[PDB]
């Protein structure tokens, strides 16, 4: 394996784009920098997790080699930054959410769902990677989260105050993709968590009573005043012209304060949206 350059580093460790010498296949080549996430876990846990939206272990040899996409979301939405196409929009999300499904099924949390781990192939395949951070259901009892700002983009309400962190978090992640791609902005940014509450707020609306609760009750937010709205902006409102409203209604879905109300994935394959995706 020739190495040809550094495709990233973060906080999970080194991924190069590598190509075998003999066969001229550029592979993504990952070691850290066992080491905290355990190789071996994601070894296994993409043994069970051969999907066509999840990214394929090629082979490994202490440490794991992948296959190459050349492109992830986050390019994607640099180069289209008013959005992607509303048909691309369905796309991506439909086989988004399908990894997710057969990562909960083996009941695995993903727990770092972002453009960045989304990669999109030449014939424009959606595949999921970076599952050092997960969590698997049973055992775990993990922290080994991915602490970085953009990260905390795609975090729950109640993940953000708090709470466990379940499948239903998985799906906040795919309802704040799935506004991105329809017009290429964060959906709820924020400098400071705290003032993605405010965010949040301004369009899903004040929190719920246990939430709202959580909050002063949490070492990270005394001394700092509520980010209150006084009059919120609904989803409907945020993409009015934007989105199909057949896919607003799974991403309103996906986006609800409450845990307990959020879609999880069978219900949103089954959703409407998707009818004739669901042939395709
Ligand atoms: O497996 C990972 N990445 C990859 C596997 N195959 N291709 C890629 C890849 O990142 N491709 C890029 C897409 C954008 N353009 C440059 C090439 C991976 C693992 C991590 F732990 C963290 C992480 F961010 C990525």
Not at 18 to 45: D, S
Not at 166 to 172: A, E, I, L, N
Request: hydrophobic share 40%; proline share 5%; net charge negative.
């Amino acid at each position: 394996f020739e190495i040809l350059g550094v495709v990233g580093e973060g906080a999970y460790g080194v991924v190069l784009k590598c190509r075998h010498k003999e066969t001229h296949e550029i592979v993504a080549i990952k070691k850290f920098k066992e080491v905290k996430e355990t190789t071996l876990r994601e070894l296994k846990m993409l043994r069970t997790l051969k999907q066509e939206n999840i990214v394929e272990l090629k082979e490994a040899f202490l440490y794991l080699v992948f296959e190459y996409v050349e492109k992830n979301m986050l390019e994607l939405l640099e180069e289209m930054p008013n959005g992607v196409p509303p048909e691309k929009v369905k796309s991506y999300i439909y086989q988004l959410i399908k990894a997710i499904h057969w990562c909960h099924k083996n009941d695995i949390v993903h727990r770092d769902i972002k453009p960045e781990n989304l990669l999109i192939s030449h014939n424009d395949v959606l595949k999921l990677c970076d599952f050092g951070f997960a969590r698997n259901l049973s055992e775990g009892n993990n922290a080994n989260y991915d602490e970085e700002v953009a990260t905390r983009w795609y975090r729950s309400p109640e993940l953000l105050l708090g709470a466990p962190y379940g499948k239903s978090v998985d799906m906040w992640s795919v309802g704040c993709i799935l506004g991105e791609l329809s017009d290429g902005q964060p959906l709820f940014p924020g400098e400071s968590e705290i003032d993605q509450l405010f965010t949040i707020q301004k369009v899903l609306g004040p929190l719920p009573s246990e939430q709202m609760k959580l909050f002063y009750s949490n070492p990270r937010f005394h001394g700092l005043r509520f980010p209150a709205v006084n009059h919120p902006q609904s989803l409907e409102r945020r993409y009015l012209g934007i989105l199909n409203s057949v896919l607003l209604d799974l991403m309103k879905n996906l986006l609800k304060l409450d845990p307990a109300d959020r879609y999880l994935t069978e219900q949103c394959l089954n959703h409407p949206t998707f009818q004739t995706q669901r042939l395709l």
